[PDB]
Structures are given as structure tokens and as C-alpha cells.
Scaffold this motif. Structure first.
Motif, short mmCIF file in Angstrom:
data_model
loop_
_atom_site.label_atom_id
_atom_site.label_comp_id
_atom_site.label_asym_id
_atom_site.label_seq_id
_atom_site.Cartn_x
_atom_site.Cartn_y
_atom_site.Cartn_z
N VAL A 24 0.79 -1.22 0.00
CA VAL A 24 0.00 0.00 0.00
C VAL A 24 0.84 1.29 0.00
CG1 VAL A 24 -1.95 1.27 1.02
CG2 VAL A 24 -1.70 -1.17 1.58
N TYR A 25 1.92 1.27 0.84
CA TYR A 25 2.92 2.26 0.92
C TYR A 25 3.72 2.45 -0.30
CZ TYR A 25 2.43 3.02 6.19
OH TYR A 25 2.06 3.58 7.45
N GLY A 26 3.92 1.33 -1.06
CA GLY A 26 4.70 1.40 -2.29
C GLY A 26 3.95 2.14 -3.37
N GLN A 27 2.63 1.83 -3.62
CA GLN A 27 1.77 2.44 -4.65
C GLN A 27 1.69 3.86 -4.34
OE1 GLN A 27 -1.64 -0.45 -3.60
NE2 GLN A 27 -1.83 -0.40 -5.89
N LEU A 28 1.47 4.22 -3.04
CA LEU A 28 1.24 5.56 -2.61
C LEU A 28 2.41 6.43 -2.87
CD1 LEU A 28 1.24 7.69 0.22
CD2 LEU A 28 -0.62 7.52 -1.48
N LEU A 29 3.58 5.89 -2.68
CA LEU A 29 4.89 6.62 -2.83
C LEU A 29 5.08 6.94 -4.27
CD1 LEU A 29 7.55 7.88 -2.00
CD2 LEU A 29 8.50 5.53 -1.94
N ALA A 30 4.84 5.91 -5.11
CA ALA A 30 4.91 5.96 -6.56
C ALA A 30 3.95 6.95 -7.20
CB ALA A 30 4.64 4.52 -7.13
N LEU A 31 2.69 7.08 -6.65
CA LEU A 31 1.66 8.00 -6.95
C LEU A 31 2.10 9.41 -6.61
CD1 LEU A 31 -1.45 5.83 -5.99
CD2 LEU A 31 -1.19 6.99 -8.23
N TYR A 32 2.86 9.67 -5.51
CA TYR A 32 3.29 11.00 -5.22
C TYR A 32 4.31 11.55 -6.24
CZ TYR A 32 1.63 11.41 -0.31
OH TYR A 32 0.72 11.33 0.85
N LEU A 33 5.18 10.68 -6.74
CA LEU A 33 6.21 11.01 -7.82
C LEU A 33 5.60 11.47 -9.18
CD1 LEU A 33 8.14 9.27 -5.67
CD2 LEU A 33 9.50 8.87 -7.81
N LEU A 34 4.39 10.86 -9.58
CA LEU A 34 3.65 11.20 -10.84
C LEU A 34 3.12 12.66 -10.83
CD1 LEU A 34 1.27 8.08 -11.53
CD2 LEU A 34 3.84 8.34 -11.86
N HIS A 35 2.60 13.16 -9.67
CA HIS A 35 2.16 14.53 -9.38
C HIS A 35 3.37 15.47 -9.26
CE1 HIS A 35 -1.31 12.25 -7.97
NE2 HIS A 35 -2.05 13.34 -7.80
N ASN A 36 4.53 14.89 -9.04
CA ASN A 36 5.76 15.56 -8.71
C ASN A 36 5.59 16.46 -7.46
OD1 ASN A 36 8.53 15.19 -9.56
ND2 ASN A 36 8.69 17.52 -9.53
N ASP A 37 5.01 15.80 -6.41
CA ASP A 37 4.83 16.36 -5.13
C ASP A 37 5.86 15.58 -4.36
OD1 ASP A 37 4.07 17.47 -2.75
OD2 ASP A 37 2.01 16.48 -2.62
N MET A 38 7.21 15.99 -4.56
CA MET A 38 8.38 15.39 -3.93
C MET A 38 8.63 15.56 -2.45
SD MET A 38 8.99 13.63 -6.46
CE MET A 38 10.36 12.82 -5.65
N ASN A 39 8.09 16.69 -1.87
CA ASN A 39 8.19 16.99 -0.45
C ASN A 39 7.41 15.93 0.33
OD1 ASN A 39 8.49 18.74 2.00
ND2 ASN A 39 6.21 18.87 1.87
N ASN A 40 6.16 15.70 -0.08
CA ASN A 40 5.23 14.74 0.63
C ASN A 40 5.82 13.37 0.42
OD1 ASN A 40 2.07 15.70 1.39
ND2 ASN A 40 3.40 17.18 0.07
N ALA A 41 6.50 13.04 -0.74
CA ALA A 41 7.15 11.78 -1.02
C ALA A 41 8.26 11.49 -0.04
CB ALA A 41 7.82 11.72 -2.40
N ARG A 42 9.08 12.52 0.21
CA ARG A 42 10.23 12.43 1.04
C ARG A 42 9.84 12.19 2.44
NH1 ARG A 42 14.84 14.62 -0.30
NH2 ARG A 42 16.46 14.72 1.28
N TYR A 43 8.77 12.92 2.89
CA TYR A 43 8.17 12.86 4.17
C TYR A 43 7.53 11.53 4.36
CZ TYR A 43 8.55 17.85 5.60
OH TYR A 43 8.93 19.13 6.14
#
Lengths: 168, 403
Positions: free
Chosen positions: A26-45
Motif C-alpha cells: 500500500v505504501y509502495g503504490q502511494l509513494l509511486a503516486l506521489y512522484l507522478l504529481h511531482n509532489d516530492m516533499n510529501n514523497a520524502r516525508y
């Protein structure tokens, strides 16, 4: 389109389902989904929230975070090598397919604005396909390539509400 | 005689079938006088309509024990409160606000003890929604929502609450004070800077300074200090404060925030080498106050300012020349720095790698676009609604007798 909905159901799922630490896919899809939006701050967090338990359990997740470390530097050739490094079938692939194409567009788009003139070898790193493949593409789009030196050049209804308002 | 808690339970359903709610507020508050396990027995035959208001009183004592929430079995008690908020709803909630708030702060304190406060965020946002109009009134559960998100990173649910600005707090029966007001805005600033939404952050931070106070608090220092750092990104020096700011921010807080005043002073000289040296001098303060990492951004923002001032002055400038003057010390980095900014859209420029120059553009708008007409038209609709809020509020004082 499809991806936006997929973040919505997953975003809901993180808070609702677990005891506080949710399962590894679940965490993996979600992380991957944040990269597509290029919302890198929330990804890192997202990765910083992740305990040491998931990092031993799941290595795929750690690959998805590695593309992202580079996105933060904004070094293109590096991005591409990491896309190839890891695959996880079904659970990572449809979103991965989108990640690869979102960074190429970002790269072509970036160059078109950024440089009135660029070296063809540097451009080759950005799109991430070799010199023969690139020089062939640029010509069709209508960008100029210079050869010998090998450089590439990119190329009533409102009004009544307002009147009604001021008169009053 | 009999036990107080059994006698109290059957009465509530009457007051919940009738217009006589003010009585009911008393019955939940006392709850049985001395309490124990005894409340758990009431829950079983508690339904006859929904579970009624009473249940909220049961949940407030059990969490306010300041021990076990309800033995290692606590997950069950959690399943019950999501049921209260969801299915029951509460239409008589305006009266319940005091217990509801007490209970909510208590929940957050307990979840923070657990392995991760993640599981709490999802109930806590739906929990606030029930007391609100649909317009959104700001109250203390808003602060605590931000706190759960801060500890367990997942800023995304909190954003629709934040992105809305408002007038008037949720009142009637207490349940609110100025610290909650200040902490909600402090944290909401903290989150927006992180997203790199410098516009909303500045605004959130300001509201944490403009609040009236006659006493010092830990949130007031932090709010001020974070304000100086943000204004150092957005502006070339600290951005103005109104004259309705509190007395306390001048008198006490300014010698209290000396280091920060020195950050702002070095930044005005426009030299990164000195700013850098200062950050190591001032370091221990940064760590204890824990606005580390933000202090780092102020340094990158000076380099951005130093590049951007050159634009104003030059049409064309070399990368080697940029590199010496900005003190980047590598033309390669000059090219890297503007390219980051191109993607951001803080700069309009183009790079000439044949000549080894940068060419500045600077022409986003000619102001004769229909795009610009539509933008100005959208801004007018906002103004006309803002005025309408003021009319209802001016009229309200017109009804009240003047002093």
C-alpha cells in the motif's frame, strides 16, 4: 486521469485500515503516486514516516525512493538508470509506466523553455535516448539542429453583477 | 440506594426526544460522579434511537483517566468513537462542544503515545466536520488535526481545512481559547512552508502574531521566529506587521529573538558567505528552538535573490561573470541554478551555450491578453463576496445597541 482516482482511494486507505503502520504494498503504490504529481516533499516525508521494519521487509519501496532522491537534485540521466533498476509486477507497473513518460515530458518541456541553444550530447541525457535517435526526432517536430559543431536549438452577465453592486 | 450511573443512563433519551436539550448538557458533564468500569455496562442497552448524546460523556471519562484508556482492549473503544461521529452525527452538538473538544484533545494525546498517530487522523477530521456549519468555523480540533499530521507525516487530509480562510470561531458553551487559535496557525504555517507554498505560509504565520495577548507563551516566540525565516524567503528583508499587533511581540519577544534579527541583517548586506558563517555561530539556538532546516532555506533564497537582481540589470551576462559575482564559483552551477528556477517559474530566461551567456527574457504578460481580463474578472467576484461578509457583520453591530 485513472491515476488521480487511485491516489484518492489509497490516501483514504492509509489512515483508515492499519493500526498505525500499514502493510508494504500500500505504501509502495502511494509513494509511486506521489512522484507522478511531482509532489516530492510529501514523497520524502512519506519515506521518513516509514520505519526500519518496512525497509528490511520491502526493497522495491526503497527503489521507488531512489528515483525520487535524484528528482530532488534534478539530474536527468540518473533518473533513467533507476527506472530500469527495479520492477515489481502489477502492484508497481501501471503507475511506473506513467512515471517514466511524466519525467520525459518534463525533460523535453524543460529544455524547450530553458535553452535557446544546447549541446546535442547533453540533450541526449535529458530525453535519455542516444544521439542518432534524438537528432532524427528533433527535425520532425521543427527544431533546428546545427551539424559540424553538433548543437541543437529549441524553439454582459459579469458586467451587470458589477454595475448592480456599485450602484446598490 | 442504587448506583448513580444506571439511573443516569435511562433519562437521556427523554431529553433527546424533546426540545429540552440544556438539561442534557448537565447530565453528560457529571456522568455518574465517581466513575470506573461501570460505564461499560450502560453501553450494551444504550441504543434506542442512536446511542444518543450520552455516549460522548462515557468516552470523555474513559480517555480522561490519565492511565489506560480501557485495559489493553483500547482498540475496541476507538471503534465506538468513529461510530459516534459517523452514524449518530449530533445535531444538538453546539451544546456538546465543551466535552467534544476535551475528548478530542485527549484522543490525540493517547494516539501520540501509541506506535504512530496515523490511525487517529482519519477519525479526527470527520470529527471536526460535525460541529461546523458547512462553511467552516475554526475551533481547537483544527489545531490538533495539524499536530497529528505533523508527527505522522501525511499532510494531505488537513489541506482543505487550511486552504479555506474564515471569520468567527465555533462557540456557545466554551470549548475554545487563544492558545488553540495560535497553535493551529503556527502549525498550518509550518506545513505550508514545507509544501513550498510560501504565500499561504506567510499569511498563516501572520495570524499567529496579530492575536491579542498580555502574557508570554512559547507559541508566540516560535511564531515570530518562523515569520522572520519565511519573510526572508518571500521578501528581500522582513515583511511588515500591522499596528494591531500585540504589545508582547515588541516588548518581550524582540530581545528574545536577537539571532534572527542578526540573520535578517546579514541577509540585507546580500553576501551568502557571511550568512553561512552566522548560521554556525547561532546553531545551538536553531536546534533547541527547532526551526532547523528552515534556516538552511533562507540561505538558498539569498542565492536566488542574488541571481534574480542580475536579471533587472542585464540583458545578457556571462555564466563565468555570474559565477564570480554571485559567488556560486562554477559556471556550471550558474546554469544549474537558473534551470531549477525555470521549472519553478521564478525566472524567465534562456541559456546560450554556444556563447557561454545567459539571456534574460522577462515577458510573461503584455496585459492585453483576454487571459488577463478573465483573471481580473475572477478577482472581482472575490471582492464582491468579501464585501458581503462585511455587510452582514456591520449589520449585526447595527442590531446590537451602541455604547
Amino acid at each position: 486521469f485513472s491515476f488521480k482516482k487511485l491516489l484518492d482511494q489509497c490516501e483514504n486507505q492509509e489512515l483508515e485500515a492499519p493500526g498505525g503502520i500499514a502493510t508494504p504494498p500500500v505504501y509502495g503504490q502511494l509513494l509511486a503516486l506521489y512522484l507522478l504529481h511531482n509532489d516530492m516533499n510529501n514523497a520524502r516525508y512519506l519515506w521518513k514516516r516509514i520505519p526500519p521494519a518496512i525497509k528490511s521487509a520491502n526493497s522495491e519501496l526503497g527503489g521507488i525512493w531512489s528515483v525520487g532522491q535524484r528528482i530532488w537534485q534534478r539530474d536527468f540521466p540518473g533518473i533513467y538508470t533507476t527506472i530500469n533498476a527495479h520492477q515489481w509486477s502489477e502492484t508497481v507497473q501501471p503507475i511506473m509506466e506513467a512515471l517514466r513518460d511524466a519525467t520525459r515530458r518534463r525533460a523535453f518541456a524543460l529544455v524547450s523553455q530553458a535553452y535557446t541553444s544546447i549541446i546535442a550530447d547533453d540533450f541526449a541525457a535529458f530525453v535519455g535516448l542516444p544521439v542518432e535517435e534524438a537528432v532524427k526526432g528533433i527535425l520532425e517536430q521543427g527544431w533546428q539542429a546545427d551539424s559540424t559543431t553538433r548543437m541543437v536549438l529549441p524553439r454582459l452577465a459579469r458586467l451587470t453583477d458589477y454595475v448592480a453592486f456599485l450602484e446598490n | 440506594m442504587a448506583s448513580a450511573l444506571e439511573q443516569f443512563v435511562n433519562s437521556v433519551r427523554q431529553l433527546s426526544a424533546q426540545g429540552q436539550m440544556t438539561q442534557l448538557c448537565e447530565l453528560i458533564n457529571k456522568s455518574g460522579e465517581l466513575l470506573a468500569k461501570n460505564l461499560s455496562h450502560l453501553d450494551t442497552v444504550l441504543g434506542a434511537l442512536d446511542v444518543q448524546e450520552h455516549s460522548l460523556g462515557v468516552l470523555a471519562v474513559l480517555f480522561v483517566k490519565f492511565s489506560m484508556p480501557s485495559v489493553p482492549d483500547f482498540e475496541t473503544l476507538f471503534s465506538q468513537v468513529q461510530l459516534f461521529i459517523s452514524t449518530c452525527n449530533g445535531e444538538h452538538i453546539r451544546y456538546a462542544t465543551d466535552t467534544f473538544a476535551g475528548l478530542c484533545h485527549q484522543l490525540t494525546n493517547a494516539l501520540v503515545e501509541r506506535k504512530q498517530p496515523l490511525r487517529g487522523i482519519g477519525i479526527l477530521k470527520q470529527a471536526i466536520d460535525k460541529m461546523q456549519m458547512n462553511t467552516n468555523q475554526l475551533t481547537s480540533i483544527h489545531a490538533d488535526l495539524c499536530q497529528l499530521c505533523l508527527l505522522a507525516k501525511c499532510f494531505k487530509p488537513a489541506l482543505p481545512y487550511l486552504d479555506v480562510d474564515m471569520m468567527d470561531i465555533c462557540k456557545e458553551n466554551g470549548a475554545y481559547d487563544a492558545k488553540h487559535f495560535l497553535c493551529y496557525y503556527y502549525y498550518g504555517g509550518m506545513i505550508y512552508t514545507g509544501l513550498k507554498n510560501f504565500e499561504r505560509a506567510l499569511y498563516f504565520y501572520e495570524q499567529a502574531i496579530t492575536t491579542p495577548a498580555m502574557a508570554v507563551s512559547h507559541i508566540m516566540l516560535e511564531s515570530y521566529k518562523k515569520y522572520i525565516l519565511v519573510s526572508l524567503i518571500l521578501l528581500g528583508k522582513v515583511q511588515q506587521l500591522p499596528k494591531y499587533t500585540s504589545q508582547i511581540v515588541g516588548r518581550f519577544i524582540k530581545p528574545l529573538s536577537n539571532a534572527y534579527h542578526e540573520l535578517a541583517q546579514v541577509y540585507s548586506t546580500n553576501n551568502p558567505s557571511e550568512l553561512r558563517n552566522l548560521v554556525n555561530k547561532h546553531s545551538e539556538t536553531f536546534t533547541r528552538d527547532n526551526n532547523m532546516g528552515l534556516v538552511k532555506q533562507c540561505l538558498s533564497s539569498l542565492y536566488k535573490k542574488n541571481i534574480q537582481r542580475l536579471t533587472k540589470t542585464f540583458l545578457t551576462l556571462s555564466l563565468q561573470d555570474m559565477a564570480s559575482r554571485v559567488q556560486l564559483s562554477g559556471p556550471q552551477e550558474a546554469e544549474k541554478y537558473v534551470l531549477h528556477m525555470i521549472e519553478d517559474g521564478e525566472i524567465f530566461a534562456s541559456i546560450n551555450q554556444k556563447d557561454g551567456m545567459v539571456s534574460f527574457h522577462d515577458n510573461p504578460e503584455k496585459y492585453n491578453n483576454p487571459a488577463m481580463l478573465h483573471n481580473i474578472d475572477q478577482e472581482m467576484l472575490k471582492c464582491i463576496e468579501l464585501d458581503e461578509r462585511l455587510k452582514a457583520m456591520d449589520q449585526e453591530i447595527t442590531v446590537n445597541p451602541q455604547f
